Amino acid sequence: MQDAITSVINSSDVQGKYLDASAIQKLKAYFATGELRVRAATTISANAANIVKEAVAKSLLYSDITRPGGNMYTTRRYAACIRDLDYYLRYATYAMLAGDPSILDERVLNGLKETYNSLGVPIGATVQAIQAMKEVTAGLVGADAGKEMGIYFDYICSGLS
Amino acid sequence: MQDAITSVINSSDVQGKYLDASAIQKLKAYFATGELRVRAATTISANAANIVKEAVAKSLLYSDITRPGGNMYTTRRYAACIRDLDYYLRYATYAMLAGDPSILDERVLNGLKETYNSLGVPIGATVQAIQAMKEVTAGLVGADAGKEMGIYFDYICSGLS
Amino acid sequence: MQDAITSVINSSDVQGKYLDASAIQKLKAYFATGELRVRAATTISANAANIVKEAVAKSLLYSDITRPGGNMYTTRRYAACIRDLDYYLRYATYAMLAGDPSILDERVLNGLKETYNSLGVPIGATVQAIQAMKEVTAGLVGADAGKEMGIYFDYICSGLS
Amino acid sequence: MQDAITSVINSSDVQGKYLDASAIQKLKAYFATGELRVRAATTISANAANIVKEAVAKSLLYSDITRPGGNMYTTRRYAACIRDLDYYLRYATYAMLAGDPSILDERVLNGLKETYNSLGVPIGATVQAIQAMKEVTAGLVGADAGKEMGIYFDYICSGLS
Amino acid sequence: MRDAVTSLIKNYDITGRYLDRDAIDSLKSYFVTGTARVQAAATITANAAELVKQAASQLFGDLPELIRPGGNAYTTRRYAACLRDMDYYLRYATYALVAGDTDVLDERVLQGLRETYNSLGVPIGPTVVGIGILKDLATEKVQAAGIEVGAYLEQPFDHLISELSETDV
Amino acid sequence: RPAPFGKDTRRILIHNGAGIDNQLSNPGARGNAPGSLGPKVFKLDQLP
Amino acid sequence: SIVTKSIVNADAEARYLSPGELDRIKSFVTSGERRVRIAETMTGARERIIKEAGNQLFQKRPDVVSPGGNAYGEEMTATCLRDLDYYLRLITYGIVAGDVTPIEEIGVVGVREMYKSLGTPIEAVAEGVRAMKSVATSLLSGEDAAEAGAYFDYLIGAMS
Amino acid sequence: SIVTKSIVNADAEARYLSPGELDRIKSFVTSGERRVRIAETMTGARERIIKEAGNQLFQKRPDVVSPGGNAYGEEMTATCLRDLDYYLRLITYGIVAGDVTPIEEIGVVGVREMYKSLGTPIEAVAEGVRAMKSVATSLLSGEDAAEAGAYFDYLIGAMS
Amino acid sequence: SIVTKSIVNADAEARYLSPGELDRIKSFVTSGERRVRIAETMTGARERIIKEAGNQLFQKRPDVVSPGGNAYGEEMTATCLRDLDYYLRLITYGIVAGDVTPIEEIGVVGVREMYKSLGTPIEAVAEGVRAMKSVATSLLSGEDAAEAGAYFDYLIGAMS
Amino acid sequence: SIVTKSIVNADAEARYLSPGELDRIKSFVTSGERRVRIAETMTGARERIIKEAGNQLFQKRPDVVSPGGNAYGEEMTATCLRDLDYYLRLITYGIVAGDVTPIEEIGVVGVREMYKSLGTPIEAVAEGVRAMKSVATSLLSGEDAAEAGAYFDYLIGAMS
Amino acid sequence: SIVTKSIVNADAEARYLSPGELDRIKSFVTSGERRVRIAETMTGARERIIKEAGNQLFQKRPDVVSPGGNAYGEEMTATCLRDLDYYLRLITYGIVAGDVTPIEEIGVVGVREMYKSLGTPIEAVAEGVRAMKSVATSLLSGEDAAEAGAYFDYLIGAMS
Numbered sequence A, B, C, D: 001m002q003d004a005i006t007s008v009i010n011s012s013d014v015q016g017k018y019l020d021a022s023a024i025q026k027l028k029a030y031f032a033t034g035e036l037r038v039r040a041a042t043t044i045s046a047n048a049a050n051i052v053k054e055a056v057a058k059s060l061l062y063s064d065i066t067r068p069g070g071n072m073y074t075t076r077r078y079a080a081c082i083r084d085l086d087y088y089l090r091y092a093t094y095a096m097l098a099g100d101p102s103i104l105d106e107r108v109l110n111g112l113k114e115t116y117n118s119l120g121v122p123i124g125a126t127v128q129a130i131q132a133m134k135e136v137t138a139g140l141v142g143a144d145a146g147k148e149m150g151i152y153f154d155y156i157c158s159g160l161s
Numbered sequence E: 001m002r003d004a005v006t007s008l009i010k011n012y013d014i015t016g017r018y019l020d021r022d023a024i025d026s027l028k029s030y031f032v033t034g035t036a037r038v039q040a041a042a043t044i045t046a047n048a049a050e051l052v053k054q055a056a057s058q059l060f061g062d063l064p065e066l067i068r069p070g071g072n073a074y075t076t077r078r079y080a081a082c083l084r085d086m087d088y089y090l091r092y093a094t095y096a097l098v099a100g101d102t103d104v105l106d107e108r109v110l111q112g113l114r115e116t117y118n119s120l121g122v123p124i125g126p127t128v129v130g131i132g133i134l135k136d137l138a139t140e141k142v143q144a145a146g147i148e149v150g151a152y153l154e155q156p157f158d159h160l161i162s163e164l165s166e167t168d169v
Numbered sequence F: 001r002p003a004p005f006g007k008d009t010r011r012i013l014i015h016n017g018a019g020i021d022n023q024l025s026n027p028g029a030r031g032n033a034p035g036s037l038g039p040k041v042f043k044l045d046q047l048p
Numbered sequence G, H, I, J, K: 001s002i003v004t005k006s007i008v009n010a011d012a013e014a015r016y017l018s019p020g021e022l023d024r025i026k027s028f029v030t031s032g033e034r035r036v037r038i039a040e041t042m043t044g045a046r047e048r049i050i051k052e053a054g055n056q057l058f059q060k061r062p063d064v065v066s067p068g069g070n071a072y073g074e075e076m077t078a079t080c081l082r083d084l085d086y087y088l089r090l091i092t093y094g095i096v097a098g099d100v101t102p103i104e105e106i107g108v109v110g111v112r113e114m115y116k117s118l119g120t121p122i123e124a125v126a127e128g129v130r131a132m133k134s135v136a137t138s139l140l141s142g143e144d145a146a147e148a149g150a151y152f153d154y155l156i157g158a159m160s
């Protein structure tokens, strides 16, 4: 993986120089809002099984994918979709503390496009679900960290698109 | 994987309705011909070491391929060629017992260009072995059962070329 | 896999003939140099940390491929690179001892050109490394056996380029 | 593997009493001298490859035991008994921070008696080595914590002899 | 594209054989139904522009869950696009009815249809119901036209069902 | 390049060794040594 | 169906179908008209079943309907009747197929991961199936209640 | 076939099946029993046609059979009767289909590049299939030999 | 504890424990005289925390108090305070341990099994625990509930 | 050969070659000037061997060439003498390798499954090889008896 | 960094982050101002460190200056002082990142095979870091020497 410090560090390591003051400025901004994210990560892990229930009833339930024909009609295929959304809540909260979307890149979004297209999983319903989920976590953490949590959700929906 | 029963109750599940009289008539069309297949699947299962024995002597034996310079020369290659033929009888009886060539798209037509090309197997001798095997099988099983079995032999070699 | 005796058997097996007087001198040229190659391997293995030392000392050290803006720079990537150069020498001991480059084409040259573009390491420095390994080796072993070791060195360099 | 903090937790839940007053001064005794242990355990890691410099050089180096015929004379039996002394230091420092010898009889003392009577290892040489390494740590952590480290060193020698 | 005649050609071409007794009787089985194939294909295109209109009003009266703002048949931008995208399923069912097999359906309409609808958000679910409503509403105008009906003319349609819809069981 | 794979599928694999000694033919032959055709199997016998 | 699990149990042993299992297939096809008469009487009274078994579920567990729990109004109680309509539909599919594999791949794999996310009790679904068992076996014949009820207990083994 | 060619033309204009191609197809399919008892008699006498046109070719073109020609030697002139065995075999596929898309996709579209790469003269095949036509019109009756003889006459136009 | 989790992690790397983690034990021992006020405050209000958080839970989910749920009756609402007190008899075992190693092995590791095996939905159990750790945060200071409330809210996501 | 499996035993440990087996390669290559001298004697009198090994076989087991047997016929012996002629080709491959893996990879591995399929008895082809062993060791002197008969032993003990 | 141990050791159990590990995150972002002042002062006198700790190292181990050793002549000792400046830079990364891991990946995991392939002694550079920590902890403050001197102590204790 990679972390926001270990991306600022590795930017100044392949150049070989020491710690620049712009990089030192790029580390103080991580430490100024580091106290906000560490309280933000507990409040999502408290409600991590709760958010997915509040997300899937916002935009997927009583609709045409959990009805005969859709990909969540078979009720032991809809159980894949709940733990498919358990990953994108877990790894986004990993990427909030990392300060870096590089958790999502080579672990989640590397072969995510090829898995969904080799199954007929609707891309356009997944981005319909994850952008619906982004409103729910911003309601539970507040509008301060909802800008921070909204970035890494939008990184998931961008690379999946 | 599915058969004539589990294609009807798959296609009538996914519309949401129950089993109706248009689809029960499709089951009775399979149930009228079910007694023909169980007599057909029994006689091939008692002669699986002998349909392969004659059909190799029909087209493969005393050829270039049996001789050195051909492919089935070494004893190690030779047995395998019986074994890589013996799946084509066992999986063709399964699709004859199914009433659907959905097994044959799934177990025995995956690598069947790319395994045989990456092993020196000639494709054109396998297709000539199979209608040499279909002629002795339809002679063994009868005229009526020979054309129902004859679909699933000609489903294989059409997908194999 | 196969060597100079197994190949000339397998060249004369698939023709169907016996060992003629046109293939025995392929064995007799091997058995004449049979005592030469075994003395060639026993000075490779006694110097195998010094052939890999003197090879990188003419090409890679004190350049700017080991600069901080470079591929070699982190010591994880150094100790792999000596070891990725160890596996070019040790199999070149094998093919000289076998008299046939078939062991190189199975394990060393398996997918090596397509791994290197997938990693990002340069190929044009690697041919400079092994051709620096070739001039160290032929001085150490002898100008007879350095000629036959130079073929199996450049057979890797033919496969990388 | 459990420390003195978990041990007073272990002896409090099982009888049906809450976190009472008498458990606190067991924890407050841990919290008083726990600042001493972090000053202790860092400096052992400064000399963890230097205590074993002194381990052979005080009681084992120029002795008759190393002279051909004794137990510590092989290179496979030399280097196996520096790691067998290095593990006895590292697991002592875990117990130096645990406040508890209950990491020793799970991972160190489980099969250590019978593996020395069977492998020809003299017991008296180890306790003349381990108790010799008590006082060199007394010059590195100060007076009081080496007497704390002497408890688990004697717990090794009570559990080895 | 690939007729029932021409599918039996490369069922026999790849093994390098002539036309035997089984070739001469399976092909005669296609030709005895060919009068019933063509006259059923006339009366399917008798009111084929009406036949999509009677089906989709019977669809959307059955699944309102596609008129009220939900899944995409909401505006007439969607609805008149829905009637066109319905009309391809009626029009290509006419071709394979005449052609014998379903290989015209295999590489004109079926390939990519799981991947076109997923890229738009069009559900595959009621499309199967839309062919399932056209399944029996095609047989009515064959029955009221005096054509006999049977597996032929009621098969092209479930080959658009059993291969388009994803396998559950 | 995606491909729509089924609910249960069997990839067909080649036995690295003897040709007949694939486990799809004889499941009672997978415990065997692969012999001279396959790779070298290691095992631990002598403990010091 | 009974063809499928006589194949995938014979493909793991990698040999042909022995005649010890081919006679059960041969007795299945000649008994085809019996199972359609089970199925048509099952689906012909689909409003008699769920309106009776919905009451018998709520007498066994009145806490789904009382204020605080899961199903309310005529919306959330109605989708509870939708799932019982599904499982009544899903149990007549295995009766015609003669095997529990079509109820397996649709609904005997993974709902213990699913219903806990939905907030419904899993065991209160299972008491709805036992009321559905006693309604349909009272409606069906005396011999086929040991056959149609031989699928009803399999849903109880799924959840409970 | 004609039925593919009537669909594929009607698919390109994106209309339904016209009253034009509804009657080309219906007139084809009521001639379907007539063409198969044309095409059986070619396959019923395939050993006579190949032997007679093989006798008819080599007296017309003696440069082929003479040494230094391509079909010289008993293994090579057995292949030229096999080289004509395929084209008689293809014509029976074209008589059944009612068109020449079996002829086109299998035996036409790369002929002149192949026969230049094999050393044979290309127009010497065009005499041979024309000699194969002259024994095929002596098999059939007169009103059918105009139908089956046109499929021979298509194959001459592909060669030369 | 936090001492216990560090030394088992350092055994996996087969080295001594790192100076990054040795800050934390040093930070734990200077806060070892900070953790003990949280432990004694829960002694003085364990009859107050549980007796308020039950009625906070029963106003949130009154399906329990209805006849048919798993705690109906005065003998059955005993355990629905006693299992809540048992979870209040778990945090003070791990406030002074710093982390979740007494939380797991007494509370978490099979808690999906036994509440299913007793019939109680854990979503109601996690609701009252969430109702508990709103009152305990209001009872403690703003600095105490800043870290212990983060430690409180582990168990709700761990249970359900 | 010895060299092609001394590589593989040294490759799977990722080592260089030990000097114990470098003696084994060096003693092998100076034995190469005399082992091919055995193989030139063997291929020089193959027709003296194969005709004599046939007549020493068919007197011993006369049922296979008497009709009702598998090798009955004028030409069916001529394949079955050729099927025994192949093992003389491989033993001369096994002589010049100093090894038995060219016997193994070519003439051992599926030899039970061929003759089960074709119908010849598996011991009856093994008795020809020991009949071939008795004549080919009579071709040579004493010091080439054991060096040729060891590879004859391995083909007998594998098939039987 | 601090997250890079914690985000991996909780991903491997596939759970969310335990609030004992959220102490480790909290535990520093309060120290990130104190961790940044020390590496600014370390870089700000990075010329005085290498010219002093490089100097009296050769008064302690004079062998590497001496002929027969590696760093004979000024053209190799200035190459030797590159690794002193590299390891001084790798100290300052590890103090800012907060723990053991960035100095481990960049400059540790090949140094028993890098330095053996260079022929240099692996123990003598381990003497130099103890002098590099001698001059550094001599110039910084007293309270940070228990922090910044311990990041020196790791790259000692895994070098020798």
Ligand SMILES: *[C@H](C)[C@H]1/C(=C/c2[nH]c(/C=C3N=C(/C=C4\NC(=O)C(CC)=C4C)C(C)=C\3CCC(=O)O)c(CCC(=O)O)c2C)NC(=O)[C@@H]1C
Pocket: A065, A071, A072, A077, A078, A080, A081, A082, A084, A085, A087, A088, A107, A108, A109, A112, A115, A119, A121, A122, A125, A126, A129
């Ligand atoms: C749920 C809201 C959406 C949805 C889910 C769905 N997914 C699958 C199948 C798989 N999902 C994955 C997911 C991942 N693999 C990864 O490596 C990562 C990164 C950590 C993720 C998130 C995989 C591997 C599979 C398939 C393997 C398998 O056989 O299960 C299904 C099953 C599809 C099917 O037909 O079997 C479903 C339903 N689909 C939706 O409709 C929602 C938008």
Ligand SMILES: *[C@H](C)[C@H]1/C(=C/c2[nH]c(/C=C3N=C(/C=C4\NC(=O)C(CC)=C4C)C(C)=C\3CCC(=O)O)c(CCC(=O)O)c2C)NC(=O)[C@@H]1C
Pocket: E057, E060, E067, E074, E075, E076, E077, E079
């Ligand atoms: C008749 C006096 C009133 C009326 C009745 C009516 N409409 C329909 C069907 C549809 N109406 C729409 C409406 C719109 N589409 C648009 O894009 C817009 C602009 C935003 C509007 C207002 C559509 C798409 C349909 C077809 C789908 C559907 O069934 O709703 C019906 C049903 C017809 C039938 O039975 O097939 C009826 C009775 N429409 C009017 O304008 C009058 C107010």
Ligand SMILES: *[C@H](C)[C@H]1/C(=C/c2[nH]c(/C=C3N=C(/C=C4\NC(=O)C(CC)=C4C)C(C)=C\3CCC(=O)O)c(CCC(=O)O)c2C)NC(=O)[C@@H]1C
Pocket: E056, E066, E071, E072, E073, E077, E078, E079, E081, E082, E083, E085, E086, E088, E108, E109, E110, E113, E116, E120, E122, E123, E126, E127, E130
């Ligand atoms: C209506 C009853 C159903 C429905 C239809 C719907 N479809 C679209 C869009 C497209 N449909 C196609 C399909 C095909 N194109 C082909 O070439 C073939 C083979 C002949 C088929 C089957 C395509 C390509 C599109 C994209 C637009 C286009 O034609 O270029 C829409 C539009 C989606 C939107 O909202 O814009 C709709 C509404 N949707 C339903 O809900 C019904 C089930």
Ligand SMILES: *[C@H](C)[C@H]1/C(=C/c2[nH]c(/C=C3N=C(/C=C4\NC(=O)C(CC)=C4C)C(C)=C\3CCC(=O)O)c(CCC(=O)O)c2C)NC(=O)[C@@H]1C
Pocket: A057, A061, A062, A066, A067, A072, A073, A074, A075, A078, G064, G070, G071, G076, G077, G079, G080, G081, G083, G084, G086, G087, G090, G106, G107, G118, G119, G120, G121, G124, G125, G128
């Ligand atoms: C009713 C007796 C019990 C009950 C039902 C209940 N279910 C839901 C929501 C869903 N139920 C399903 C289940 C299935 N869908 C299927 O397609 C199949 C197989 C054919 C099954 C088993 C699904 C997917 C959902 C979610 C969306 C949907 O409704 O399809 C609810 C609503 C819960 C909510 O929060 O909205 C209810 C009430 N719950 C009970 O309490 C009864 C024990």
Ligand SMILES: CCC1=C(C)/C(=C/C2=NC(=C\c3[nH]c(/C=C4\NC(=O)[C@H](C)[C@H]4CC)c(C)c3CCC(=O)O)/C(CCC(=O)O)=C2C)NC1=O
Pocket: B065, B071, B072, B076, B077, B080, B081, B082, B084, B085, B087, B107, B108, B111, B112, B115, B119, B120, B121, B122, B125, B126, B129, F012, F013, F014, F015, F016, F017, F018, F019, F020, F021, F022, F024, F025
């Ligand atoms: C059903 C799933 C399945 C597939 C596709 C399958 C294919 C298959 N065919 C193979 C071999 C082979 N197959 C043949 C083929 C033949 N003999 C002939 O003479 C004909 C030309 C031809 C077939 C009629 C040969 C000649 C070899 C190679 C055996 C080897 O070299 O090891 C091999 C390698 C043998 C091994 O496993 O090591 C595989 C895997 N096996 C399977 O279990």
Ligand SMILES: CCC1=C(C)/C(=C/C2=NC(=C\c3[nH]c(/C=C4\NC(=O)[C@H](C)[C@H]4CC)c(C)c3CCC(=O)O)/C(CCC(=O)O)=C2C)NC1=O
Pocket: C065, C071, C072, C076, C077, C078, C080, C081, C082, C084, C087, C088, C091, C107, C108, C109, C110, C112, C115, C119, C121, C122, C125, C126, C129
């Ligand atoms: C014989 C069979 C065999 C092969 C083919 C083999 C190849 C091989 N060489 C590799 C890497 C490598 N190869 C190099 C290349 C070089 N070193 C340099 O610095 C130069 C630029 C260049 C050669 C002169 C480097 C730097 C790596 C490590 C790449 C990395 O860690 O990112 C890797 C990636 C391993 C890894 O990085 O974890 C493989 C698999 N190992 C084997 O056993």
Ligand SMILES: CCC1=C(C)/C(=C/C2=NC(=C\c3[nH]c(/C=C4\NC(=O)[C@H](C)[C@H]4CC)c(C)c3CCC(=O)O)/C(CCC(=O)O)=C2C)NC1=O
Pocket: D071, D072, D074, D076, D077, D078, D080, D081, D082, D084, D085, D087, D088, D091, D107, D108, D109, D112, D115, D119, D121, D122, D125, D126, D129, F048
């Ligand atoms: C983590 C806890 C732990 C400890 C402490 C431990 C010791 C241990 N010491 C062993 C051997 C040994 N131990 C010694 C010990 C010594 N030699 C001497 O000169 C002195 C008497 C003594 C100095 C320490 C020797 C010589 C052997 C190898 C026996 C041999 O030479 O064959 C072995 C047998 C395997 C081997 O090393 O070959 C174990 C398992 N193992 C553990 O898992």
Ligand SMILES: CCC1=C(C)/C(=C/C2=NC(=C\c3[nH]c(/C=C4\NC(=O)[C@H](C)[C@H]4CC)c(C)c3CCC(=O)O)/C(CCC(=O)O)=C2C)NC1=O
Pocket: B061, B062, B063, B066, B067, B073, B074, B075, B078, J064, J065, J070, J071, J072, J076, J077, J079, J080, J081, J083, J084, J086, J087, J090, J106, J107, J111, J114, J118, J120, J121, J124, J125, J128
């Ligand atoms: C070098 C590896 C190798 C082996 C093992 C091999 C065996 C072999 N033996 C064969 C036939 C045969 N082999 C025999 C052999 C015998 N009949 C007897 O009764 C005797 C026991 C025995 C020999 C002494 C007979 C009768 C046939 C003809 C079988 C038939 O046509 O039914 C054939 C089929 C004919 C052909 O393809 O040419 C093969 C491939 N070929 C090889 O290339």
Ligand SMILES: CCC1=C(C)/C(=C/C2=NC(=C\c3[nH]c(/C=C4\NC(=O)[C@H](C)[C@H]4CC)c(C)c3CCC(=O)O)/C(CCC(=O)O)=C2C)NC1=O
Pocket: C061, C062, C063, C066, C067, C072, C073, C074, C075, C078, K064, K070, K071, K076, K079, K080, K081, K082, K083, K084, K086, K087, K106, K107, K108, K118, K119, K120, K121, K124, K125, K126, K128
């Ligand atoms: C990022 C991790 C990392 C480090 C730290 C590193 C050092 C490093 N040391 C080098 C050489 C060297 N480094 C040393 C250093 C020493 N030998 C001694 O005796 C002393 C113990 C010590 C210095 C006081 C010497 C002597 C050489 C030259 C080796 C030779 O000439 O054979 C070189 C090649 C020369 C150059 O590029 O200028 C590098 C890249 N390389 C790395 O990849």
